[model samples]
Target: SPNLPPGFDFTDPAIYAERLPVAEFAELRSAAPIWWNGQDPGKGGGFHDGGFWAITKLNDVKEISRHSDVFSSYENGVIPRFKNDIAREDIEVQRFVMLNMDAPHHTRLRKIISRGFTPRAVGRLHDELQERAQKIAAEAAAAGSGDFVEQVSCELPLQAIAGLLGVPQEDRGKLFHWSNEMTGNEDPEYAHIDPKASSAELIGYAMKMAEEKAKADDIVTQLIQADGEKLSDDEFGFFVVMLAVAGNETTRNSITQGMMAFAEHPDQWELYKKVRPETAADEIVRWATPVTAFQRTALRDYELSGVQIKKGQRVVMFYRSANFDEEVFQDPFTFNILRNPNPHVGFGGTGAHYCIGANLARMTINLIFNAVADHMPDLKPISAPERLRSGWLNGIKHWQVDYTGRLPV
Candidate 1:
């Protein structure tokens, strides 16, 4: 490893919550593409217990992401510092969740569950998505200044994911609350419980949802009714809660961060308005990589960018840093909506685990941006955003915005 920077702690929740270690990441990306971070190991107080190798380079991250067999997510899980002291019975439940497994098991679950997120499948909901986005834009215009994160960002995905899970419309708020509680426990507003307890609480809620909708034709129901491969109640709950947290939190933060990018860079926004392209949505994702980093364990000894990694060691790929690597992008810092040849791994790099909901996320961003741009051209933030105090997600929990006078709804 090259000369490691002092105080460059990527595992600390405060580093990401207060602000990203952008400068430090930039330095490391250039100085040492793969640097060792000797931080806490599986500690109780919001820390990844063992130290890890931080992969900051774009190509290196992609290599690790693609070669999942070597860089496994199963042994210790994807969350570097996350220590879930689960029982032996919960092992099957953990295995059932796609994010926490390796080949065979991961491939199996992904094949079964990923069908619901295909282009053709997501395409079926375009009309409904547009309708929902239009309603949000119209409502936001009517109300003037509002918490865009709440009123606009969270509304659409909550409904769509709920429908997919066969969750009732009225009970969608529970998913929202549970998602925040699971991931945003570091934030003052959502600090009532630790992430472990938050996940347990969400599992409890999901168990109830599953029991009530066992026979429904939604994804949850299908997972239950899998012939010769049915999930246990706990596994069902585990899978449901995973979907809620990953589906809700990442997409919601993407929307919020995309809007913040527009509000921050008016020039880019005008460029988008003048000439919108299909590529714009991806550029937004690149600029605002919502999911920060995911942990992986080395199944065998490996070397990335000349840095040696031993077997059973934890490796964390800093996707946020890779997105901003100057060597890859022309202007990595500038908010360019029309960026072309953008190979950003904001959706967790390119691999067997590359974001399964990529199509849905792109659709959501494009639909909302297109509708809101037409209806709320003058939209801009009125004050600083109240960002979430969590390292896991790069979230803007509350962003107040004013569209000035109402546009024609």
Candidate 2:
């Protein structure tokens, strides 16, 4: 903490939502890289549980993530101030997914489930994603201008993830509804989501898939007969729900945010249309870090860079802030897609627990971008973007855009 700014209020939602005082954070990197936010532990945020040191710098965030012994995901819960996780607790009680686990157990479990989401695995779905995106662009073209978030963004993730889970197209509506109900309770757009919505029926979805997997070759099938360690029906439900919430919201929001960012800077869109579009993934991920920051508790009480942190004390790594950190990024104010070696913390820092879905996320966004460029060659924004209320999930709720699928047929 270099110098305290006058009139700073931690409890102020407006200021808190505004997020990591950019200039101040940039200034503190050299002196106080791992800055502790001496503030209030507000409700509902991923790590809004204040009084914990905020690891705003990228290197620091990575360092902490790499050392799980020093920083634990299971201590004080995987999130700070997110006490409203009746669903999360329920999932924990049901399934033993790697997200909430710690140590060698987490490592082994992750190695098992992660094989299905690898690059080779996600690549098989590109054609399907492209076909679906084309349908969306074509439909939007017919409608003239439509809600991009609903019409395109939201639909694609559910379709893709559902297919991966061996879910039927017709039953996607149920999974979609459950995903919203479970995750959207914090979101302002879908406030009607029942927080108490517990589902023993989710097991039915898994068991049905288990039967299908008993015959065919799919991820669900693998989960059923993984050989090494089998996931129980409840565990399957837990992981499926987690995957849905993570996939549905994050992928959808990134799509909407990417389009919104492009709309704001049409020149860049034009450049990309004419120039190389391979860099689009980096740009979009950096521009709109979907999941934002997650919480990590101090596994062992120790000192990091003069900051005396006791064990069990909560700490947070604000990836969104680090995305815009001026220290690492040259000229952080401007948005440049070609930022080389852009080691962005947007995807939850580096090391063992970086992000399992990171490669898939990049592939998902890239696939959509290619489809949009090829099909809807001339796309334009139709409405101002809407951000989710809770800072936990940085997702776009509603975004309207005008696009026509005029691909040379």
Candidate 3:
């Protein structure tokens, strides 16, 4: 693989914190679409105790994500870490979450969860979601200038997921903190506390809540009613934590990054303002590509883009690069809100493992975008947005913004 370009490091969290290596990703996508990356020096596990294959093309990423049989998520879990790199205990604990499972188990759990996460069910909360979005928009506008990441973008999903989980409004802050710790752990904003500690806190809380009586409207209650075979305390905790973390962080980042992108191209901002919220929301997800990469293990042997991946080896599919694939998206780098025929893997491509909360996330972002565009039309960033220090999770920790809207009396 010496033919590969020199010095493109995806493993370093700092590189992304400074700025996305779009140039490098573009170079690799064209020159070495299926490049072999060496072992991560920080976490010494991936690709069968060695290095992993990095898949960049849109077709390859989608194909790999769809073939759960060939590319197993069961082997080492998704986040591109080694078996022992994280707590062996934590890996075993998280296996209960559908993201880390495969085949019948993934199928079974996903079916049960889908009862509450259906498109119709999520849509039923339209008024509630809209109300929350309006309130959040008002708060941000009233502030006039503040960290939109913390003050505005983070709360919409936090409140939504908490309400679904039967968590009280007062406890939503804990969920936000715990989510930041898990997803944005590499950032200084959340790096002070050990992520494992936050994981433990969320797990313990969910386990305790599982034993108590939850509101009938909550998904937590719905999950328990699914089957007599019911989830164990550990499994329930992991699943609940997954909802809290996955349901919040990525969508929040998408909101922040979408604003930044729109600011960069005011013409695009005007386009977004004019377009239907749902359509613009789709573009936002495509542009954000929040969850950068998800690792898959080869069940037997696989050849992707002319690169041979042996059995039990890890292959990391880079969604960010795929979203910008020049072959798939016309003028891929351009910020076009009206990108017709946009097919992005921002939600993990098309598969059984596709994001369950996709509808809810899109709705949340759409509502917020509409509310802000209407009430805070002159919204502008006060400074450059700060990026999270994680290669796996592309996020903005904070960004200040100012708007012409008057503060509430």
TM-score per prediction, in order, is 0.87, 0.86, 0.91
- The alpha-carbon lDDT assigned to residue 134 of candidate 3 equals 87
For candidate 2, list the clashing residue pairs, or say none.
Answer: 36-53, 41-50, 95-235, 301-311
On residues 144-189, what C-alpha lDDT tens digit does candidate 2 reach at each position? 6778888878777777777677677788888777765655455444
Q: Residue-pair clashes per candidate, as listed?
A: 7, 4, 0
**Candidate 2 global TM-score:** 0.86
Give the better candidate number (1 or 3) by lDDT.
3
lDDT of 3 by residue, 1-409 (tens): 4343454556557677888878878878878888877754545432236677878899999889889999988777888743225555665655767899998998888877787787667877778778988888888788778998987788888777875676777877887678667656656766576877888899998888877843366566777764655666666888877887787889998999888888889988887777754677778998898988888889888777677889978888889999999999889888777777779899987988999999889888988898888778878777798887776888888897886524432
- Model 1 TM-score is 0.87
Task: List the global CA lDDT of all models.
Answer: 0.76, 0.67, 0.79
The model with the greater TM-score, 2 or 3, is: 3
Q: Of the candidates numbered 1 and 2, which has the greater TM-score value?
A: 1
- Summing lDDT over every window of 10 consecutive residues in candidate 1, give the lowest-scoring window: 40-49
